[PDB]
Write a protein that binds this ligand. Structure first.
Ligand SMILES: CCCCCCCCCCCCCCCCCC(=O)OC[C@H](COP(=O)([O-])OCC(O)COP(=O)([O-])OC[C@@H](COC(=O)CCCCCCCCCCCCCCCCC)OC(=O)CCCCCCCCCCCCCCCCC)OC(=O)CCCCCCCCCCCCCCCCC
Ligand SMILES: CC(C)CCC[C@@H](C)[C@H]1CC[C@H]2[C@@H]3CC=C4C[C@@H](OC(=O)CCC(=O)O)CC[C@]4(C)[C@H]3CC[C@]12C
Ligand SMILES: CC(C)CCC[C@@H](C)[C@H]1CC[C@H]2[C@@H]3CC=C4C[C@@H](O)CC[C@]4(C)[C@H]3CC[C@]12C
Ligand SMILES: CC(C)CCC[C@@H](C)[C@H]1CC[C@H]2[C@@H]3CC=C4C[C@@H](O)CC[C@]4(C)[C@H]3CC[C@]12C
Ligand SMILES: *[C@@H]1O[C@H](CO)[C@@H](O)[C@H](O)[C@H]1NC(C)=O
Lengths: 235, 104
C-alpha cells in the first residue's frame, strides 16, 4: 500500500523536476522520442490552422485523430498535468491486473498438483506465495522509472495515451468484462491500426475464464466468439 | 521628385547628319558625404537564421525611413514543399511590440 504511493510520489516528483529545467526543449525534439504521428508541435499547428479557417488535413504536417483535437482543444492550458495523470493511470492498471493474474496462476497450479499430472522430482520449479508477493509493485516501478517513459512524458508525446488505453484493455479483460474490453480495444485500434492483433489473445483468455472448451464441434464457443466480434466491430 | 533632363533629338538634322555623328559626354563622380541624397523611404532585406541540417527560421526586415508618415505594404512569399513550415510560429514585431496584420 505505502510502497505504491511512495513509488507514485517519486515518479511524479522526477517528472515535475524535469519539466522545469533547461533540457525540456532539447528533449522535445529528439527523433527517437517523437514521430510525425506523436509530436506536440503538430497538435498546436493543427489547432492554429483551425483558427485560420483552413482544414487541418489539407496540408502535410498534421496526422492526428479528431478526438485528440477535441481533448486538447479543451485542455491546452493544463497540458503538463494530463501526461502525469495518464502515466499514473497506466501504472495503477498494470498493478491491479498483475495481482489478479497471480491469483489465477497459483490457483491453477495448485489444482494440477492433486490431479498429480506433474513429474515426481519437479520441485524448485513450483511457484510459491512468498515469491509472487512483490511482482505487481515491481511491474509498476519498471514502467514508471524507465528512462524511456520519462523521456516520452517530458516531450508530451501522444504515445502515452495509447499505452494507457492498452493497459486499460488488459485490466478490463483480466477482470472479466467483455463489453469494456471491446470498447477499449476499439479505442486503441482507432488511434493506431496495429492493436487489432490483440483480439485473439483476449478472446482466448475470456473463453478460458468461462470454462468453455475451445473445439470445432462446440456451440458455446461460436456463440461467445460471435458476440465479442460484433461488439468490437460496432464500437 | 522634380527632375531635369537634357533631350537630344536624333531626328533633327542639326544634331545628326551624314557628315557628323553623336558622342555624348558626362562628368560625374561620387558626391561628398555631405550633399548626398537621402535614402529611400522603403527598403528591405531577407536572411536565414540558425545552423545545422534540421531546423531553421526565415526572417524579413522592412524599413520605413519617413519622418512622420506611416503607410501599408503587401507581402507575398512562396516556399517549396521540402521546407515544411509551422504557421503557429509566425511573428511580426515593430519597435518591440506585436503588429497584427489586417489581411492574411
Ligand atoms: C472481427 C475481428 C477480426 C480480428 C482479426 C483476426 C481474425 C482471425 C481469427 C483468428 C484465427 C486464429 C486461428 C486460425 C487457425 C484455426 C484452424 C485450426 O487450428 O484448426 C485445427 C483443427 C482443430 O480441430 P479439432 O477437431 O478441434 O481438433 C482437436 C485436437 O485435439 C487439437 O487440439 P487443440 O487444442 O490443438 O485444438 C486446436 C484448435 C481447436 O479450435 C478450433 O477448432 C477452432 C478453430 C477456429 C477457426 C477460425 C474460424 C475460421 C476462419 C475465420 C473466419 C470465421 C468467419 C468470419 C468471416 C465472415 C463470415 C460472415 O484450437 C486452436 O488452437 C485454435 C485457436 C483459434 C482461437 C481463436 C479464433 C477465433 C476466431 C474469431 C471468431 C469470430 C466469430 C466467427 C463467426 C461466428 C459465427 C459463424 O484441426 C483441423 O482439422 C483443421 C481444420 C481444417
Ligand atoms: C469455417 C468457416 C466457414 C468459418 C466459419 C465457421 C463455421 C464453419 C462454424 C460456425 C458455426 C459452426 C457450427 C455450430 C454448431 C455446430 C453443432 C455441433 O454439434 C452439436 O452442437 C451437437 C450437440 C450434441 O448433440 O451434443 C457440430 C458442429 C456445428 C455444426 C458447427 C460447425 C462449424 C460452424 C458451421
Ligand atoms: C475514473 C477514470 C478517469 C480513472 C479510473 C482509475 C481508477 C478509479 C480505477 C482504474 C483501475 C481500477 C481497479 C482495477 C481492478 C480492481 C480489482 C477489483 O477486484 C476491485 C476494483 C479494482 C481495485 C479497481 C478500482 C478502481 C481503479 C483503481
Ligand atoms: C467516443 C469514445 C469516448 C467512445 C465511447 C464509447 C463507445 C465505444 C460506445 C458508445 C456506444 C457503444 C455501442 C452501443 C451499442 C452497441 C450494440 C451492441 O450489440 C454491441 C456494442 C455496441 C456497438 C456499442 C459499442 C461501443 C460504443 C460505440
Ligand atoms: C550637317 O550636314 C549639313 C550638310 O552638309 C551641314 O550643313 C551641317 O552644318 C552639318 N552639321 C552641322 C554642323 O550643323
Amino acid at each position: 500500500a505505502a510502497p505504491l504511493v511512495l513509488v507514485l510520489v517519486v515518479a511524479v516528483t522526477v517528472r515535475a523536476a524535469l519539466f522545469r529545467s533547461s533540457l525540456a526543449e532539447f528533449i522535445s525534439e529528439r527523433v527517437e522520442v517523437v514521430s510525425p504521428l506523436s509530436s506536440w508541435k503538430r497538435v498546436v499547428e493543427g489547432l492554429s490552422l483551425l483558427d485560420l479557417g483552413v482544414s487541418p488535413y489539407s496540408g502535410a504536417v498534421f496526422h492526428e485523430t479528431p478526438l485528440i483535437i477535441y481533448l486538447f482543444h479543451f485542455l491546452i492550458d493544463y497540458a503538463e498535468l494530463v501526461f502525469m495523470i495518464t502515466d499514473a493511470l497506466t501504472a495503477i492498471a498494470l498493478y491491479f491486473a498483475i495481482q489478479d493474474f497471480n491469483k489465477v496462476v497459483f490457483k491453477k497450479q495448485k489444482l494440477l498438483l492433486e490431479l498429480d499430472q506433474y513429474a515426481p522430482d519437479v520441485a524448485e520449479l513450483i511457484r510459491t506465495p512468498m515469491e509472487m508477493r512483490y511482482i505487481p509493485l515491481k511491474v509498476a516501478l519498471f514502467y514508471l522509472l524507465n528512462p524511456y517513459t520519462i523521456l516520452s512524458c517530458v516531450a508530451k508525446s501522444t504515445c502515452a495515451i495509447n499505452n494507457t488505453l492498452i493497459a486499460f484493455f488488459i485490466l478490463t479483460t483480466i477482470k472479466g468484462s467483455a463489453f469494456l474490453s471491446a470498447i477499449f480495444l476499439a479505442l486503441a485500434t482507432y488511434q493506431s491500426l496495429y492493436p487489432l492483433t490483440l483480439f485473439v489473445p483476449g478472446l482466448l483468455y475470456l473463453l478460458q475464464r468461462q470454462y468453455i472448451p475451445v473445439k470445432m464441434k462446440s456451440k458455446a464457443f461460436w456463440i461467445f466468439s460471435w458476440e465479442y466480434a460484433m461488439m468490437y466491430v460496432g464500437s | 521628385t522634380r527632375k531635369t533632363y537634357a533631350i537630344y533629338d536624333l531626328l533633327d538634322t542639326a544634331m545628326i547628319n551624314n557628315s557628323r555623328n553623336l558622342n555624348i559626354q558626362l562628368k560625374w563622380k561620387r558626391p561628398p558625404e555631405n550633399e548626398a541624397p537621402p535614402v529611400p523611404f522603403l527598403h528591405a532585406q531577407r536572411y536565414v537564421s540558425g545552423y545545422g541540417l534540421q531546423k531553421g527560421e526565415l526572417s524579413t526586415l522592412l524599413y520605413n525611413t519617413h519622418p512622420y508618415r506611416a503607410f501599408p505594404v503587401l507581402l507575398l512569399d512562396t516556399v517549396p514543399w521540402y521546407l515544411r513550415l509551422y504557421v503557429h510560429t509566425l511573428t511580426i514585431t515593430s519597435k518591440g511590440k506585436e503588429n497584427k496584420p489586417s489581411y492574411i
